[PDB]
Ligand binder design. Structure first.
Ligand SMILES: Cc1cc2c(cc1C)N(C[C@H](O)[C@H](O)[C@H](O)COP(=O)(O)OP(=O)(O)OC[C@H]1O[C@@H](n3cnc4c(N)ncnc43)[C@H](O)[C@@H]1O)c1[nH]c(=O)[nH]c(=O)c1N2
Ligand SMILES: *[C@@H]1O[C@H](CO)[C@@H](O[C@@H]2O[C@H](CO)[C@@H](O)[C@H](O)[C@H]2NC(C)=O)[C@H](O)[C@H]1NC(C)=O
Ligand SMILES: *[C@@H]1O[C@H](CO)[C@@H](O)[C@H](O)[C@H]1NC(C)=O
Ligand SMILES: *[C@@H]1O[C@H](CO)[C@@H](O)[C@H](O)[C@H]1NC(C)=O
Ligand SMILES: *[C@@H]1O[C@H](CO)[C@@H](O)[C@H](O)[C@H]1NC(C)=O
Ligand SMILES: *[C@@H]1O[C@H](CO)[C@@H](O)[C@H](O)[C@H]1NC(C)=O
Ligand SMILES: [Mg+2]
Length: 585
C-alpha cells in the first residue's frame, strides 16, 4: 500500500505529492493520464511555445446555446505537470476579495490573509535587470513575493517596441501603472509575471519544480500514462483506486492507500472520477445504473471558464520588430533564435504571440458611465434564470450566493472583471474573467474511456454580454488613443470601426468568442452541502471519509486573474491541512 494516492499529476497533484513526501515515512503514488514531457523546445523555450503537444484528445463541447449553437474543441492538459507544462506561463494571483468571498460562502480559514503565506511559500521571484525594469516600467513589491519556494517566476528579458505604444495608450484611457498585480489588486497595466526560471530562461512547470527537483525521493512514486477509473471504498471510507492504461488496453489494477485518496484530475477530470465512483447527482447515477455512495447534486455542476475574444487588426505603420516578425521574417527569427541559443537574450524569452504587458479592469473602470445599469440588470434578475429549470434547489442556492458575491465585486473599484492584451502583431485579446454563466460536465456512460459531456453554457446569462461588450469598447479606446494611433491600427473584418452599436458589436462577438482559455474550474465546488457544494472547507468530499479534491474543481468561482498561481498556492495550503490532520513531518 501507499500512504496517499493522488489521481492526476498536474499542478495541484504534484505540488501536494512533493510536500507530503517531505516526510520519509509517507509514501505517495501519483497516477497521471499523460506521459512525461521530453524537454522539447516547444515546452521549455518560451518563443517556441507549442501547447498542442499534450492536449487531451477527443474532447468537444455540446452546441453552445449562447454562441449560435457552435461546438468547440475543448482544451485541457494530458501530461505530467498538467496545465503548467503547456500553458502560456502567465503567473498572476487573484484579488483580495476573491479569497475573502470564498470564505464568506461558508468556508472557515479562507481569505486573502490566509492565502498570502501560501502564495509566498509557493515561489521564488527573480527580479528583472535594473535597466529592463527602468526602460520597461517593471515594478513590484518585494515584501509580497516569495524568495525561497519551488516555483520560479520572473519576466522576459526583452520587450517589443510596440508594447511601449500600447502601455502609453492604456494610460491615456484610464488604465494606470499598477505597482504590483500580486498585491491583491491590479487596476490598470503591468508586466505579466512569467513562470520562467531565469537561470536558463526556460519554463518552470510543476514537472520540474515539484517532481524533478525532489525525484531522488524513493517515497515519491509516479505512474504516467494511466487513468484513475474509480475510487474504491470500504463502506463510506475511500481506501484505493482502480486504474487502467490511458491508451485503452483491456486491463484494470487496484491499488490502496492507508490514509487518503486525493483527486487532482482537473475541472474536467475530477467530476468524472466522482460520478463513475457513485459520488454525484442520484438522477445521473440512477440513469447509468451506478450505485449511489454519496448523493451530491453539485458534482459536475457550476462549470466556469474565462472566455476569450481575438480581435483582428491591420496597421499602416506598425513598428519593427514585433511578434509577427518571428513568423514572417526568417532572418529576424533566425537571428533571435541564435541570440537566445548564445546568451539567452531577446524575443525567444517571451511566450510566442504574447507581449510583456497586460491590463485588468473593474466593471466601473471598463464602463464608468453605465456600470450601475449593468449591476441593476443583474440585481433584478433571479439567480435561478441562469440555470435550467429543475436544477437541484441546493445548487441554485449556491449559485445565488456566488452571484451575490460577484455583484458586490461588480460594485468594487478594486476587483477585475476583464483583461486586455496586445501581442504587438495582428490581433488583440479580450478576456472575460467573471462570467455569471454556469455550465456542466457529466459522464455519458460507465466506460472510463468515454469523454464526458462538456457544456460551457457561455453567454447563457445575458448579463455576460453586457460586461463583455463594455470590455470590447475599452479595448477599442486603447487602439484609438494617441500613442496607438501613430501605428495606424484599424479593426479588420469581421469587426470594424463601422460597428458602432452594442447590437452590431455583440452579434460578431457571439460568433467569435471562445468559451474557454483552458481555465476550467469549479465542478466540485467548496461550498456547504446545502448550497450544492461537493467539498468542505478542508476539501473533504461530503458523505465519505479519506477523500479530498485538490485541483481547481474545488473553487467556488473564477478569480480576477488566471488560475495557475492559485492552483500552486491552494495545493501548498492543502498539504499543510493534510499534514496537520495526520500528524506528518
Ligand atoms: C493551453 C493552456 C493555456 C493556459 C492554461 C491551461 C492550458 C491547458 N491555464 C490554466 C491552468 O494551467 C490550469 O487552470 C491549471 O493547470 C489547473 O491546475 P489543476 O491542478 O486543477 O489541473 P491540471 O490540468 O494542471 O492537471 C490535471 C491533470 O489530471 C490528469 N488527469 C485527468 N483525468 C485523470 C484521471 N482520471 N486519472 C489520472 N490523471 C487524470 C490530466 O492529464 C492532468 O495532467 C493558464 N493558467 C494561468 O494562470 N496562466 C496561463 O498562461 C494559462 N494558460
Ligand atoms: C529558483 O528557485 C530556487 C528556490 O529559491 C532557487 O534555488 C536556490 O538556488 C541557489 C543557487 O542556485 C542555492 O544557493 C539555494 O540553495 C537554492 N534555494 C533553495 C530554497 O533551493 C533558484 O536559484 C531559483 N532560480 C533563480 C533564477 O533564482
Ligand atoms: C440553437 O438550436 C436550438 C435548437 O437546438 C434552436 O431553438 C435555436 O434557435 C438555435 N439558436 C440559434 C442562434 O440558431
Ligand atoms: C514607461 O513609462 C513612461 C512614463 O512614465 C513612458 O514615457 C514610457 O514610454 C513607458 N515605457 C514602456 C516601455 O512602457
Ligand atoms: C527582417 O529582419 C532583419 C533582421 O533583424 C532586418 O534586418 C530586416 O530589415 C527585416 N526585413 C523586413 C522586411 O522587415
Ligand atoms: C465595414 O468595415 C469592415 C471592416 O473593414 C468591412 O468588412 C465592411 O465592408 C465595411 N462595410 C461597408 C459597408 O463598407
Ligand atoms: Mg539582478
Amino acid at each position: 500500500n501507499y500512504t496517499f494516492i493522488i489521481a492526476g499529476g498536474g499542478i495541484s497533484g504534484l505540488t501536494l505529492a512533493d510536500r507530503l513526501t517531505e516526510d520519509p515515512r509517507v509514501t505517495v503514488l501519483v497516477i497521471e493520464a499523460g506521459p512525461l514531457d521530453r524537454g522539447e523546445d516547444g515546452i521549455l523555450v518560451p518563443g517556441a511555445f507549442s501547447p498542442w503537444l499534450y492536449f487531451w484528445p477527443g474532447l468537444v463541447s455540446t452546441p453552445q446555446a449562447g454562441l449560435n449553437n457552435r461546438t468547440v474543441d475543448v482544451i485541457t492538459a494530458q501530461v505530467v505537470g498538467g496545465g503548467s507544462t503547456i500553458n502560456a506561463m502567465v503567473y498572476l494571483r487573484g484579488d483580495k476579495d476573491d479569497y475573502d468571498s470564498w470564505g464568506a460562502l461558508g468556508n472557515p480559514g479562507w481569505s486573502w490573509n490566509s492565502m498570502l503565506p501560501y502564495f509566498i511559500k509557493s515561489e521564488t521571484f527573480t527580479p528583472p535587470s535594473p535597466e529592463l525594469a527602468a526602460a520597461g516600467n517593471i515594478t513590484w513589491d518585494g515584501s509580497i513575493r516569495g524568495r525561497s519556494g519551488p516555483v520560479n517566476y520572473s519576466y522576459p528579458n526583452y520587450f517589443f517596441p510596440g508594447s511601449e505604444n500600447w502601455w502609453n495608450a492604456a494610460n491615456e484611457v484610464g488604465l494606470p501603472p499598477v505597482k504590483d498585480p500580486m498585491a491583491g489588486s491590479k487596476q490598470g497595466v503591468f508586466w505579466i509575471p512569467s513562470a520562467i526560471d531565469a537561470r536558463t530562461m526556460t519554463r518552470s512547470h510543476a514537472r520540474r519544480n515539484h517532481y524533478d527537483r525532489v525525484s531522488s525521493r524513493p517515497n515519491y512514486h509516479i505512474l504516467p500514462s494511466h487513468l484513475v477509473s474509480k475510487i474504491l471504498f470500504r463502506g463510506k471510507q475511500a481506501i484505493g483506486v482502480s486504474y487502467i492504461p490511458t491508451s485503452g488496453g483491456n486491463t484494470t489494477t487496484n491499488v490502496y492507500a492507508s490514509k487518503e485518496i486525493t483527486l487532482a484530475a482537473g475541472g474536467l477530470g475530477t467530476p468524472k472520477i466522482l460520478q463513475l465512483s457513485g459520488i454525484g447527482p442520484r438522477k445521473l447515477l440512477n440513469e447509468l445504473g451506478i450505485p449511489v455512495i454519496s448523493d451530491l447534486p453539485g458534482v459536475g455542476q457550476n462549470l466556469q471558464d474565462q472566455p476569450t475574444l481575438t480581435i483582428p487588426y491591420t496597421f499602416t505603420n506598425n513598428v519593427f520588430p514585433n511578434t509577427d516578425s518571428l513568423t514572417t521574417n526568417a532572418t529576424y527569427n533566425a537571428e533571435q533564435r541564435a541570440l537566445y541559443d548564445s546568451s539567452k537574450q531577446g524575443a525567444y524569452t517571451i511566450v510566442n504571440s504574447l507581449s510583456t504587458n497586460i491590463g485588468v479592469m473593474s466593471l466601473q473602470r471598463a464602463a464608468p458611465k453605465s456600470y450601475r445599469q449593468i449591476i441593476a440588470a443583474a440585481r433584478a434578475r433571479s439567480a435561478s434564470l441562469s440555470l435550467p429549470p429543475g436544477t437541484d434547489p441546493a445548487v441554485i442556492r449556491g449559485y445565488q450566493a456566488q452571484r451575490n458575491a460577484i455583484l458586490k465585486q461588480f460594485e468594487n473599484p478594486n476587483v477585475g472583471v476583464g483583461t486586455v492584451h496586445w501581442g504587438t502583431g495582428s490581433s488583440a485579446l479580450v478576456y472575460h474573467l467573471k462570467p455569471l454563466s454556469r455550465g456542466t460536465v457529466n459522464i455519458r456512460s460507465t466506460n472510463p474511456l468515454d469523454a464526458p459531456e462538456i457544456d460551457y453554457r457561455t453567454g447563457t446569462d445575458p448579463i455576460d454580454a453586457q460586461v463583455y461588450t463594455s470590455l470590447f469598447r475599452k479595448n477599442r479606446e486603447i487602439f484609438n488613443a494617441p500613442s496607438m494611433r501613430v501605428l495606424g491600427p484599424s479593426e479588420a473584418a469581421p469587426f470594424g470601426a463601422n460597428l458602432t452599436t452594442d447590437e452590431e458589436i455583440y452579434a460578431v462577438m457571439r460568433e467569435l468568442i471562445n468559451p474557454s482559455n483552458a481555465h476550467q474550474c469549479c465542478t466540485a465546488a467548496m461550498m456547504p452541502k446545502d448550497m450544492g457544494g461537493v467539498v468542505s472547507s478542508e476539501q473533504k468530499v461530503y458523505g465519505v471519509q479519506g477523500l479530498r479534491v485538490a485541483d481547481i474543481s474545488f473553487w467556488p468561482f473564477q478569480l480576477s486573474g488566471s488560475p495557475m498561481a492559485t492552483a500552486y498556492a491552494g495545493a501548498e495550503r492543502l498539504a499543510d491541512v493534510i499534514k496537520k490532520e495526520h500528524r506528518l513531518a
